[PDB]
Amino acid sequence: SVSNDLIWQVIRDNNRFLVKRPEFGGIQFNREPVNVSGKNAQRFSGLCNDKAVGVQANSPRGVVLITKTNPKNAQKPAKLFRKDVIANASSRKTYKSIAGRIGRTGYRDDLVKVSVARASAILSSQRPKKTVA
């Protein structure tokens, strides 16, 4: 009846988190909070996949790990999403923590590299600006 493939078929070309631009031959972006790669693909879409990973910018410093909980909570959106916050420590520690909580657990082995890259980008955006006046 309702499956991940069915959900993707419904929302592939029409959903809130999809930004579609006819420029450059029809490019697309995915803004789902649980989509780390940023691409509009079913494998990378957090709205469908039971196990999904996302990386957001923590305030005022750090990153936030978004992990989908057990599929039995699919009908309970309040408990469906899990939030993890890292301390103000080294980027190497943050990448190691992300890899341990994503890959070494067997949750999403294909998303560890992109999750680390997104965390690196967020931290490299959060670092203080060397204003050359």
């Binding site: 930004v19 631009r21 420029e23 450059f24 031959g25 972006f29 803004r31 790669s37 940023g38 992109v114 890259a117 997104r118 980008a121 967020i122 490299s124 955006s125 959060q126 600006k129």
Partner: protein
């Protein structure tokens, strides 16, 4: 995004647009029964053809190897967090100067190049 080569740089101006002001420069396919341009006689203007199509790898790329992605707000700028080495932010013309300052600051923080900064 390396060795970007354009087959043709001319804009394919419409026939007789240089002679008549009521005829715009936007290309129109000539469909006259005695159209020398349509028949492609020597010395006449060239018509756009599929062969003029640029390489798919270098298509839509600016001379710096990037693609000018239009952004209207900080949320639009955040879309290029991961695609920093392929897309460059272009601030929309209707964005106010107050919001443009925030857009520039966010693009600088994310490392995204701005095509029309300042």
């Amino acid at each position: 995004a390396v060795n970007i080569i354009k087959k043709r740089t001319k804009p394919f101006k419409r026939h007789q647009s240089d002679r008549f002001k009521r005829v715009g420069e936007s290309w129109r396919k000539p469909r006259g029964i005695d159209s020398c341009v349509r028949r492609r006689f020597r010395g006449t203007i060239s018509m756009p053809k599929i062969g003029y199509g640029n390489n798919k790898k270098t298509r839509y790329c600016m001379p710096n190897g990037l693609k000018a992605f239009l952004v209207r707000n900080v949320s639009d700028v955040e879309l290029l967090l991961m695609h920093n080495k392929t897309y460059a932010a272009e601030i929309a013309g209707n964005v106010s100067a107050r919001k443009r300052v925030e857009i520039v600051e966010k693009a600088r923080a994310l490392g995204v190049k701005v095509t029309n900064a300042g």
